[PDB]
Write an enzyme that holds these catalytic residues in place. Structure first.
Site, PDB file in Angstrom:
ATOM      1  N   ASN A   1      -8.864   5.538   2.904  1.00  0.00           N
ATOM      2  CA  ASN A   1      -9.519   6.346   1.891  1.00  0.00           C
ATOM      3  C   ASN A   1     -10.441   7.411   2.489  1.00  0.00           C
ATOM      4  O   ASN A   1     -11.259   7.127   3.354  1.00  0.00           O
ATOM      5  CB  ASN A   1     -10.287   5.386   0.999  1.00  0.00           C
ATOM      6  CG  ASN A   1     -10.861   6.082  -0.191  1.00  0.00           C
ATOM      7  OD1 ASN A   1     -12.024   6.473  -0.118  1.00  0.00           O
ATOM      8  ND2 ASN A   1     -10.064   6.354  -1.186  1.00  0.00           N
TER       9      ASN A   1
ATOM     10  N   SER B   1     -11.379  10.922  -4.343  1.00  0.00           N
ATOM     11  CA  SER B   1     -10.900  10.656  -3.009  1.00  0.00           C
ATOM     12  C   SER B   1      -9.397  10.493  -3.031  1.00  0.00           C
ATOM     13  O   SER B   1      -8.766  10.439  -4.092  1.00  0.00           O
ATOM     14  CB  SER B   1     -11.567   9.426  -2.457  1.00  0.00           C
ATOM     15  OG  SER B   1     -11.150   8.252  -3.098  1.00  0.00           O
TER      16      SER B   1
ATOM     17  N   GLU C   1       0.842  -1.224   0.000  1.00  0.00           N
ATOM     18  CA  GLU C   1       0.000   0.000   0.000  1.00  0.00           C
ATOM     19  C   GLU C   1       0.866   1.258   0.000  1.00  0.00           C
ATOM     20  O   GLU C   1       0.578   2.165  -0.752  1.00  0.00           O
ATOM     21  CB  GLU C   1      -0.977  -0.026   1.168  1.00  0.00           C
ATOM     22  CG  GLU C   1      -2.090  -1.035   1.053  1.00  0.00           C
ATOM     23  CD  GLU C   1      -3.156  -0.731  -0.022  1.00  0.00           C
ATOM     24  OE1 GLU C   1      -3.059   0.360  -0.643  1.00  0.00           O
ATOM     25  OE2 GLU C   1      -3.968  -1.659  -0.297  1.00  0.00           O
TER      26      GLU C   1
ATOM     27  N   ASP D   1      -6.135   8.330  -0.780  1.00  0.00           N
ATOM     28  CA  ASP D   1      -5.706   7.332   0.221  1.00  0.00           C
ATOM     29  C   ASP D   1      -4.515   7.896   1.017  1.00  0.00           C
ATOM     30  O   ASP D   1      -3.600   8.461   0.420  1.00  0.00           O
ATOM     31  CB  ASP D   1      -5.311   6.054  -0.466  1.00  0.00           C
ATOM     32  CG  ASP D   1      -6.404   5.184  -1.028  1.00  0.00           C
ATOM     33  OD1 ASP D   1      -7.539   5.450  -0.834  1.00  0.00           O
ATOM     34  OD2 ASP D   1      -6.045   4.156  -1.677  1.00  0.00           O
TER      35      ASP D   1
ATOM     36  N   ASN E   1      -7.174   9.025  -5.954  1.00  0.00           N
ATOM     37  CA  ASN E   1      -7.955   8.002  -6.662  1.00  0.00           C
ATOM     38  C   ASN E   1      -8.727   8.648  -7.798  1.00  0.00           C
ATOM     39  O   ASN E   1      -9.038   9.851  -7.768  1.00  0.00           O
ATOM     40  CB  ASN E   1      -8.898   7.375  -5.648  1.00  0.00           C
ATOM     41  CG  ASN E   1      -8.170   6.813  -4.452  1.00  0.00           C
ATOM     42  OD1 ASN E   1      -8.573   7.022  -3.252  1.00  0.00           O
ATOM     43  ND2 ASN E   1      -7.127   6.148  -4.638  1.00  0.00           N
TER      44      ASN E   1
ATOM     45  N   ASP F   1     -11.814   8.490  -8.431  1.00  0.00           N
ATOM     46  CA  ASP F   1     -13.106   9.046  -7.974  1.00  0.00           C
ATOM     47  C   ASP F   1     -12.933  10.387  -7.282  1.00  0.00           C
ATOM     48  O   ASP F   1     -13.958  10.948  -6.916  1.00  0.00           O
ATOM     49  CB  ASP F   1     -13.870   8.052  -7.096  1.00  0.00           C
ATOM     50  CG  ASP F   1     -13.257   7.776  -5.745  1.00  0.00           C
ATOM     51  OD1 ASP F   1     -12.209   8.370  -5.414  1.00  0.00           O
ATOM     52  OD2 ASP F   1     -13.916   7.083  -4.985  1.00  0.00           O
TER      53      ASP F   1
END
Ligand code: NA
EC number: 3.2.1.17
Length: 129
Positions: free
Chosen positions: A59, A50, A35, A52, A46, A48
């Site tokens: 998120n 958002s 990650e 992380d 991301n 969308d």
């Protein structure tokens, strides 16, 4: 902070992730490796909109507030910046909520694609736990 693998294993164990929801410590270390590369300051936008955040790439769509993710939730009740601290307490507390949510560690795409079904105990090999 860029953790070492055994350093991170010790911190995750301190905070109660070993065997949390039945996921051994090696799963959590492997997830963090893929990650964040063990980097508490990691951030990734991301598609969308958002983002992380942190060692476990939590998120802003659901878990933390970053002020720029419309129509999102803050279920860990924390600013996303808290998740970037050298102290992993806030990330671990939020990860415990995430992994309890119904799909377990499949919430972490890097875990699903790179750790699930593999020899995750290798990630804690040699560590003094
Ligand atoms: Na949010």
């Amino acid at each position: 902070k860029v953790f070492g693998r055994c350093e991170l294993a010790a911190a995750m164990k301190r905070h109660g992730l070993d065997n949390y929801r039945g996921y051994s410590l090696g799963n959590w270390v492997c997830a963090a490796k893929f990650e964040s590369n063990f980097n508490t300051q990691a951030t990734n936008r991301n598609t969308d909109g958002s983002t992380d955040y942190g060692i476990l790439q939590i998120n802003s769509r659901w878990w933390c507030n970053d002020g720029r993710t419309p129509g999102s939730r803050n279920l860990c009740n924390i600013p996303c910046s808290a998740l970037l601290s050298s102290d992993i307490t806030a990330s671990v507390n939020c990860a415990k909520k995430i992994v309890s949510d119904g799909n377990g560690m499949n919430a972490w795409v890097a875990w699903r694609n790179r750790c699930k079904g593999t020899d995750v105990q290798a990630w804690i090999r040699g560590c003094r736990l």
